[model samples]
Target: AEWELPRLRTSFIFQDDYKSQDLAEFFDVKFYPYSPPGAPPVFAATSKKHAVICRLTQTTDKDANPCEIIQLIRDDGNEANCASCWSKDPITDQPLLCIAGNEGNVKVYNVTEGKLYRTLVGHGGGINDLATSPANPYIIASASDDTTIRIWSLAPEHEKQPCVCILGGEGHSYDLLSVAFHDNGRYVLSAGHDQVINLWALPEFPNEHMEIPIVIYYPHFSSSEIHNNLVDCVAFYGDLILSRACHEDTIVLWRIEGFSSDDPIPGPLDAPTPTDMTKQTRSYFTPSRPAMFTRLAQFHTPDCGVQFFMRFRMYHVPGKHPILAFANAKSKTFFWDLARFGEYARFMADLKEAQQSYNGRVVVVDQGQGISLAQAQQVHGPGVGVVMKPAWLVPKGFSRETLQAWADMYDLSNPVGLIKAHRSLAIDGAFVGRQVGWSPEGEWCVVVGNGNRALIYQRWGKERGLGS
Candidate 1:
């Protein structure tokens, strides 16, 4: 029930050219999810040349060994820049691998069997990220440069399911960079180059009543009046959604309610009878409706400067606050106190608005303080008189201004040696956020980059670290 900052220590390092297998550029890294508790952790990393599954154990002793290495491209298309993803198989509940390259093909591999299971082709451009539903391992969502997000299923019933649904035609105007499904499997969030975050309600497939594929809800766009820029990442914390844009140096927290469930089957009264066989039965499918969200608040740091890849890890183990982490172009990592703001957000939503009678009292106090309506009008123009701005005008508890100050207190300068210490050890320069990942339990962390080095760190204790 206490929050302790993670005292990260390097447990293993892969720094030789041999570790990178001649391909110097590393794109992404991920931890295998199906590993048993207390077992040596297994993880994967990808490069333009190949994808590797590695194991770190006592036998390896401060070293990492490749369990398998799959080629980046299977054809003569010369496609590279492979991005790797791993999740559990819904049918067998076994670990599976999905690798996306510049060729616009998503190749799913059965990691246990070490062979290609199925190929999903729909995106016109390369895929950027893949998110698999934890609740329904059969469902996977993919974001692509084609400005679209596609949901595909791995259920045995729909064997070789190509694309269950698409969520982009009118939802996004630019390339989609990231996609994530809520743990409940009812919603999907996508971030695109258009500088907007779109939330989509997942449609029921294999249903007799639904005609629409995906229900696109209102998007979260940066207001020109409020300021900011393009979205770089999107994540979910239960019903709350978080999005960040590196260029704008801002993260927004949003709240949405309601989602779709299995629609009721048509009753006999709604259905045609056998006697009416001469007439065709009309399609009674009723598509699910979209949901709307309200902006709770926006958070940022004063001098964060072009941070990217905002990642959030929500810890619900009693006293811990949800953690939001990101790294700037400086390779400096930052953490925000989400639980603190979450409390503030709830207070603001429930607090009563300033009463009209109280407004009069405040005006009287302002008058006594020397600023009156007539005097204010004399100094300014007519009709410009005002006692004070309403309490609602300013977001109640932790406003953006206050959130910025909070962020300043937790700016970490390279928790791992990826930024500077790894320089001398790397053939190329230091790695600056090429890829970062955390184990399911958040006990282990890893980062790899252009430096051709992979640094692994273990969390210090049970208490979550809030930073110095």
Candidate 2:
């Protein structure tokens, strides 16, 4: 079978990829720095009436299942909703799975122990999403339909006063559908029907109330700036915040520019005047929020027919490109490798080298408003946010040989391309794609389709090798 990926990255072929049946000890020895050196590569997924502790299978077959067992409490038929996983309790040193349910309830399971360790209840409405802190696994934040976000701590001996703080009662006017904790563990993000994303300082959880420090973006529905539909998923990619709203067919990645009056004002191009804000008003010259949020790059998702609210996941390891995984309504999942289209001196330069290797023609897919290389030379040449298409382009002096080589790869009947797209695969027959999860180290990818469907994709190699 032909591989659509790079050489060293070629081993992830379905059914073709194989591994030792028992990786418990292998994972322990290789990925020791994360867990206590022996924890299994633990992960889980939730659906209506189902919660499963999933493990990597030896094969990447569609029918093959992970080490899954149906928990009784999850058998109640109530809907369970990136489920945060691979979090280990600092005390027990065992991995934990925090799954939020529709009734605004949270269950933290000691996945290694296969039992429920704690239960949290406080949200007045459905808990749409839940997230545990990156700095500390014991700390968690949840978003609810009550238009508020609650912080909870799961540290041992702190159960009696687990509720640390509740945020956004004054900020989010409608149901908050998503919540995420920044990697720093000091900030939290929440968004929903209000169409505004609020970044608030996470108060320390020994239990004290502070006057929540928050920076709100897309004021008054941001129709022209952000999305027009209800915001669905919000997550943290290191310091940057990533989010998507329904009907938008887009996921925008951005970061907060540190909110303080002393922060420098942005240039005209950096923070272009919003369509709603050109008039000379009292607030115009006063300059509220000199530099609040800077929208960075936009990732496109086509083929959304019925599905909405699907969550995007990120994967990264040291010295490699950060990878983002997202899907369309048709269950087609695409992984965008940022390094492929980021710095001009690196990815773009490599592209130019490869084209020169064969005297290539970079195919431009008309997915977005396209300006030919003739117009955007200064920007495109450096390759800031650009990448090559799937097909090759080498024009030999011999006309017959040149067209023959191109005929096999592409029809060239016509084409454009995914500038940021790196690779893609489908979760066939799953019916609906909802959420995707990467193993603690980044080899296995689990995609949860409609109810009770968890499709596990075993990657080619273990955590460390990156010869490609």
Candidate 3:
């Protein structure tokens, strides 16, 4: 049973501290957004599941799960998807979906079947971001690199041809980075190189007929401060508008509580729901404060320098926890255990191989050159590629011996007790690697983005390991 709502509307809100405070003490940031100044990565969340999307520079092509990899079925030379996107169903507790987007191309995947059902085509660019219409699951809105916004109907009759609506929207001089639909399912929003957010409403089923096709454009609604920066990502549920940029290392929040097309005002500080002080922040510093725009979080990596190939992950622990984890170009990863709010955990500094590149899953007890003390080692990549999946960071309070013991238990069929990481992967020309994920059953761990594709990997033992 999926947590199905005939009509589900969720309120979205986020707080950005401009001071670079240890605010993660409030909401744990699993992977530091590593966004441009004043640019907060955009996020979308269900009651128990959330997705954080960011724009990174060059990612580790030779490492583990290349974050989120959206396959690009080249169509007319325009677009590709941002890899796969899925959320766990609190009702069924299973993968609800694993979507692969294609611009100028079409794709349909059914989780129940574990197979792709269709491939949609006829667009000019790749699909950047996709949103499920809160009003109708059969209808989804996609923003493309083509500088166009499209609405599609999954129903048999309208499945192939998108309800192409291009009013108040135009191809920017550059590519469009992201698109999000309001939880209401009525308003569609977009952001990209023009440094603006565009909102649209459907006047007709497939096309707008108001002469000029009445469109509303909100220019310079950048939540970040960096100039000439791309609006890397955008997400909205309820009234919150979360966005991140490419040139600065900051995240911005706008609580659009009372919003209307005619008169839109900046949201206020207090949201409808009381902010949970405990689950509000995560940081390596004592105060465990939220992040400040322009201020760097303790974990910082230089711009990856490429596009659509890097990867990282962000998870919400539900309780007070340092909500972020990120791997640099090296064999290390960082963690901000929110549990130690006043003394937030600094990251993967504890890994035995602090100097090695974090190839894959950080909980497999896998070992690498730098992690000479890892509990185990799994191969990454293909025969000759780097073994990055199952790559792991040293957890707090747990020693190498403890990890080995736990691995032994899982192998021995104890069938219990460990919040360890599950393996995952993503492989393609733009990228190749596995990632981290929670078991299909619970929400203990997940994969990251910034790299290419995100896949999964596990070990079957050496050639002589054919045991019972």
Candidate 4:
């Protein structure tokens, strides 16, 4: 059974945010565009040699109005690929900006002084994404194409700064495209071109041998199935769960375990002796092997194209859980209720059975000449081959008569219990701008596409109209 999705109403709130000359050099859509809401509403963009920060404003004018220019931090001659803004510095209350460059270097800039505060180096390739810890803003993580992830400390210190901690090992075989730190600040999740996601547990402090991570999470759970395509982005929902967007036109929801330090260990352990274990022993005890990740549900976009990235936001609506928003290269935004799909009960079960059945029976032969029933039935399109097979072909003990009957039990082709929003802007164009961002309180959302204009939407109340 499916439920009706709520329709969202938003307004074109910001326009002319940048000058004509400002837009020309910085107009490339590749920079990280949206600002994190921890501080004032300030967004960052870049040209060849400088990074610009703009503060948003409230408009009394009848038409959309943009924000005020804040600071322009010079990057010399390097191109800034990604940037994150925050106000969580333990030492000072002022907001700060961390920008990563194409030269595999990171610069922490002070917004007030417009000067370089610290430089973080170690990545051999350009930094693709950057994230600051929700718990500790002093700690930052950067993802790079060199098949490595690095962590840096920005805590104000009178002593010399600490060296960066790099996370790379035999576990990650390809370039990492994105990285996200868990709210706890000890564990990090990374995804990239390798078609897998790795969850690494960092040591309390940096060690000389920190190159190899403590624990790596292998997201693929079965012998017969997986994304088998490049994983473009990853983000966490609260703490225990996450969602992955792949180039395969599907978004997979995974439940993470063994991450929280509060959770008790499952197996027996020896009592503490007079002598403690070494750092290597601690690493071994923390489970370096691929930790368990259960695939809960799967969602596919209406169109079968690449979904470059996905984001998660929690709303204050009663009885409603967090919502996941993502868009394809075409700029159509989709939102899905995480709890609704899991609570649907029958639908999830049917979908799981269909997946396992199709995977178990699938086989590849003659390179590219032919395939099997499972391969053919693993159709992601609007339920094409899902129900075409007979009951005996599927695993035993299932009540469904035909595969189509099972497929009819639920609809995974589109978003469930969530609404669709559309716009015509450069958002669908060739930029790295974050197309969607939510206010810290989750009451409103902002979207900027291919153009210089941006839209802000207020969440609708229980009724269909917008909230007052």
Candidate 5:
């Protein structure tokens, strides 16, 4: 397959309020968000339809967290603008979507049965990343800036008080950025800002051999010093492809070869064997595969120019080519033709590059799945989210050195909007943005995190008729 330089098709200032950082993680200054995690991104089920979700909130050095999960639907066929959905209270069974922030936290909201579900307090800090256990849909895993990861069980009914599972604890000092569970739920891998990837072996629940309520098992962590750059994302597709960010310029792919088919747990030899006594059995460890880093091709060929402060997306399609989208710290987004990188770069070039734009940042690529037919050709895809850095972050007075810094941060060939700064030294902004999602149905592209903010675009669907 051939890849082309992505062009901006239909760009919108989706949200102007949600902010994260300024001049490097400043406290009071509010920076606009383009793409932020926890808010599931805009997704398109078909070629033309789309949906977006964003958590719009005021910027904070503490945590630019948003609680309400707002829905925005855009169906070009019917001409619908920002169609809002009221998240019913989970208890009363009313349509629920907007979740309240708890004690200084950025919680994630999930959509179920045309409603939104909010995450209960599991960690002290805001939720960092969200991943579902492949074996169980109800079993969800989340990482936190609080330096820990949590697992929770969701039920079909709201009445079922959710069960929060610690799974295990991590002692890494840095904030945890990404986490992914293995197919069998036996292992959990996580990466943090401290430049460490921790792998934990989850203990079997209701362990017959131990016969204990608290199933305690220490995680066996095997970390590789793969990316000196801050790790941003991780994706585990069955036991097949486990891809991760290795600096903003490239993505690392690990083909882990391991799967378990109900391994038996050994019974005690000293146990009494009576006529009524039966052998206690339990499912244990899945076979361990060689855990090593397989360096893939450089996603951003520094020359193309873009650096990411926050994160990137890697579409995990089964047989089709995998795509990586980078949200440059500033300027235009970069989409790498993954099929080429996977085919050539993985086999040809050395993983390390000496370019500045390729440093400690995320690459540009699509999240969840590949962009739809309409999206592939258009500058903006249906489910794609735009990333932008805050204005105040860059130094007031620009210079050759400052421009070079922006280029390094975003890995751009040239920053289009930069001005000469010879008078004052201004800090570069930290990256912030929204995560958007498309519903499986090809009707609307939803937007969340933009708390209390109404859509600025004209109506294009059923809701417009209601208002008319």
Candidate 6:
């Protein structure tokens, strides 16, 4: 099967205020799981002040409107920064959409009806982000600039007061910017201004509701070593967590690995889980702090400006490499095969002799080099060092070091304009992408950001039929 960043399907711009040079915004996009009783398979995207739910279609007619908006949710609150939705709300048995604002309230809407449903209030600072639990849409967790993460139960009874738990008042020293729930709903991850990443243990709700939301002080685990700069985003990748800080120019992968999934993150209620002491795991652990949040790898996303709102996207297409996509300031989109490094390591692991190793053998990465994938590519020889290039050479690997090495070695003479700091492209400044998104089926990708634009990319081979 063919694999690459999907070809651009349609590119359009937002109006009025969206038409600016520095339109730093975060776009959370979702596609309907199926055609509900009234709605077809529609796509929805929410940016700074609007949520545009549109139907995607393909037609060659010169004047055809391929993107037809079904409903438009506007700036209900100041700086509507984040959004998430569910096709069928467990409580209402109807579709629902949520938008968290920098103005300090979470906006909820009935998607099928295209109207505001409720406004949840509590936090004193702007809400930075929120996520609906895969296990129960009614249960959601939000991160805020006020330094607290609030867990809410959107059940009808809780509508007048949905927040069920208040978390991180004492865990984070500064404001919180990102938060996420593992698929199992057993743990929650968050990070922000304090430059610390925290994982909290989640207790199942009792059969009845509480008079007031519970307040928890400590995270099951906390690590300040994950991101040196303030982190803006964190997400669960299967059993792993993906996080990033704008200054880092990369997305780092990590996870809680000291114990079994059945275990909870150690906190006031539970004892610490035994840590993983193997070389691979122990290296990330230390006695000064619990090292459950072990870092795994970093994906280089070069020259995207220092905008913290720009978020990367990931999808694991069956039998294919884990698809990672993000855009640079020049508007150029990049697709990295996260599994490429595994292939490289698998090949090297078969080589017992130095001659079969990278150091003994010279090669250019991505130019038919000896290895790829981020995980398996090794530098040692029993394991000899590999990766050799004209300046791009590094004992070979996709590590952030290799990217850094290439940038330093380049030291380009004409590094200005589109050429500043990193590689240059003729069309670099035409569009600035703030976020990347795709459907669960991996059929399309949508990027929205500066130049007041929204770009839709369709997977190369699997285009929706002529007029759908």
Best by TM-score: 6
Where does model 4 exceed 4 Å of error?
1-74, 83-90, 157-159, 206-226, 257-261, 264-291, 304-321, 338-435, 448-455, 460-468
TM-scores across all candidates?
Answer: 0.62, 0.66, 0.42, 0.60, 0.47, 0.74
Q: Tens digits of per-residue lDDT for model 4 on 158-275?
A: 1144444666544466777767776677667777777666656565654333433333232211111235677666765555444545555555655554345464322212211113
Best of the two (3, 6) by lDDT: 6
The positional error of residue 182 in candidate 5, measured at the CA in angstroms, is 4.0
Candidate 6 weakest ten by summed lDDT: 415-424
- Native-to-model Cα distance after best TM-score fit, residue 113 in candidate 1, in Å: 4.0
User: Model 6: per-residue lDDT, tens digit, 1-468?
Assistant: 333446666777665444445554536666664454334347777777777787776555434455777788776544556655553565567767778777888877787777777777888888877777777767888888788989988776665567788885456877787788787876788888888777776776654657788777666666677777888778878877888886777778766665345554344455223254231222212335555555666666676676676677787646655777777666577666555444434434443243454544543334334445332246443343343222213444246775555434232222121111222222334776666777655656677666556777765443334543
Where's the lowest-lDDT run of ten residues in candidate 3? 2-11
lDDT, candidate 3, 1-468, per-residue tens:
111101101111222221253221011112222124433222212111112332212122323222232222221223323434333323343333323344445454443434455555545766655555655555556666677665655554554454544533232444566666665566666677766554444444542222222233322122233224667555552354444455433233343323444443222111122134342221111115333122112223233243322233333333323233333222233333323322212223333243345543243234344553222333333222122222233343357785564343222223122212222122222321112232211112333332322222212111232223
- Tell me the tens digit of each residue's lDDT in model 1 across 1-468: 223333334422333332434336556787776677666567777655556666644222323332323323232246665466776676587778888877788888776676777788868998878888766666788888888877777776556444777775455678777787776775677876676666555646772222434533232221211225666677776767667665665556655443223333233234212244342211222126433444555554323466454343333323444555443344444445444444434333333232342432222112234565566656655323234421222322235774443333322222211111101111123335556666655555566655455555444333333332
**Against the unseen true structure, what C-alpha lDDT does each candidate score?**
0.53, 0.54, 0.36, 0.49, 0.37, 0.64
Error of 1 at 317 (Å): 6.1
Candidate 1's C-alpha runs over 4 A off are: 11-25, 56-77, 89-92, 207-227, 257-321, 337-430, 461-468
Best model number under lDDT: 6
Clashing pairs in 4: 29-431, 29-432, 30-432, 387-403, 387-404, 426-449, 426-450, 426-451, 427-449, 427-450
> What is the TM-score of candidate 2?
0.66
Worst 10 residues of 4 by lDDT: 216-225
lDDT minimum window of 10 residues, candidate 5:
24-33
Comparison by TM-score, 2 against 6, better one: 6
As for model 6, its CA RMSD to the true structure in angstroms is: 8.8
315-401 per-residue lDDT for model 2 (tens digits): 766655577876667757777656544332343355556566545644332212365444544555644333433232435622667
